[PDB]
Each structure stands twice: as C-alpha cells, then as structure tokens.
Design a binder for this molecule. Structure first.
Ligand SMILES: OC[C@H]1O[C@@H](O[C@H]2[C@H](O)[C@@H](O)[C@H](O)O[C@@H]2CO)[C@H](O)[C@@H](O)[C@@H]1O
Ligand SMILES: OC[C@H]1O[C@@H](O[C@H]2[C@H](O)[C@@H](O)[C@H](O)O[C@@H]2CO)[C@H](O)[C@@H](O)[C@@H]1O
Length: 179
C-alpha cells in the first residue's frame, strides 16, 4: 500500500478523518486563471512563478462552477501536509512531513487533465478523481520550488487556512481581487 489515505464508505480517501488530496507539479508560464499578472497580457507577476502557489482542480477552483477566470476560490490558501503516501509509479515518499501553505492563483481544468483534475463535483459531494481523492492541487514549479521541498507528487491532507501576510499582499495585485 503506497497510498495511505483509505477510502471511506463513499470512496473518498481520508487519513485520520481528514480529507486527502493528490498533488502534481506543473510549469507553463501563463498568467493564470486568477489574473495574477498585468491586465490584458499573458504575463504573470514574478511572485506568481516563484512562490508557493497552486492550480486546484476545476470544481474546487470555482466552488462547484465551471468558470475558469476569477473562480470563486481565487486567493484562498490551503495547508498541505504529506502523509508519506503516493500513487505507485507516479510519485514517491517525501523526506519529511512538514506542512506547506499554498495560495490558489490558477486552475487545473478537467479538459486535458482527466486523471488528476477530472472530479465532477466540489469537495463534500463524494466525487473523486481516478485515484480516489476529492480534490487535486497542481503545484507551480517554474523555479523548482517543488523540487526544493523534495515533493514528488505526495499524497497530502488538506485544509483551507488564512493566507500568510505576504501572500495576501501579493494577491491584492491580481485582477480577480474583489470580483
Ligand atoms: O494533469 C495534472 C498535471 O500533471 C503533471 O504531470 C504529472 C503526471 O500526470 C504524473 O504521471 C507524473 O508522475 O507526475 C507529473 C508531474 O507532477 C503535469 O506536469 C502538469 O502539467 C499537469 O497539469
Ligand atoms: O493565463 C491567462 C488565462 O488563464 C486561463 O487559465 C488557464 C491557465 O492559463 C493555465 O495555466 C491552466 O493550466 O489552465 C487554466 C484554465 O484553462 C484562463 O482560463 C483565461 O481566462 C486566462 O486568460
């Protein structure tokens, strides 16, 4: 057993009651779906390529909706804690289980990402991806910040938390702030 979160009676993987999430890493250079770059361009602010920012799966990104621009959960923060698990052949066990906070600045759409982001309802509705998780976090890795954590697609528990002050201040520059 590489995945340590056991499915509950509804098929949702949990660890000691807490919901689990899968994670991946991505690089694409786009401004992204929360508008964290110059208006009218596809150029991100440097912080949005450098910091701990994430593109969640679409139904969490827009809280049940399908909007891929200024989704309802733009600017929220999530704390991800590795369990030690991973999907066999698609990750590995990390060196420690320190939790890391990420801010939502982009979206992982169902289209083109069916294995990990193809979840047809928001968390709490018992819809899961192909690996049994109710939500997925794709982690921005333009500058190698995920490799610096030594995370190779870890299984995590997840929760929403208030954003650290620096990430709050960053988000104020994004076009979706106050939409
Ligand atoms: O579709 C989500 C995300 O996947 C990333 O690729 C994964 C891949 O699916 C998995 O088999 C392999 O083990 O890990 C890579 C890296 O996390 C891809 O890099 C992203 O562009 C994509 O959004
Ligand atoms: O980059 C501006 C552009 O972002 C679009 O979201 C994309 C995002 O660029 C890409 O990094 C991610 O993997 O997919 C999302 C959703 O397709 C957004 O939908 C556009 O409105 C926006 O102009």
């Amino acid at each position: 057993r590489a995945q340590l979160c056991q499915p509950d009676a509804h098929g949702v993987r949990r660890f000691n009651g807490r919901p689990c999430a899968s994670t991946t890493r991505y690089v694409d250079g786009h401004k992204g779906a929360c508008g964290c770059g110059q208006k009218g361009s596809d150029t991100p602010f440097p912080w949005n390529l450098q910091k701990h920012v994430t593109a969640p799966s679409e139904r969490y990104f827009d809280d049940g909706g399908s909007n891929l621009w200024c989704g309802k959960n733009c600017g929220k923060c999530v704390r991800l804690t590795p369990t030690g698990g991973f999907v066999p052949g698609k990750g590995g066990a990390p060196p420690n289980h320190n939790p890391v906070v990420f801010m939502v600045t982009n979206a992982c759409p169902i289209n083109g990402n069916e294995e990990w982001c193809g979840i047809s309802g928001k968390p709490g509705t018992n819809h899961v991806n192909s690996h049994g998780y109710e939500v997925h976090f794709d982690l921005q890795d333009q500058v190698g910040q995920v490799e610096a954590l030594h995370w190779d697609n870890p299984e995590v528990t997840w929760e929403e938390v208030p954003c650290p002050g620096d990430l709050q201040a960053n988000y104020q520059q994004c076009e979706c702030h106050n939409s």
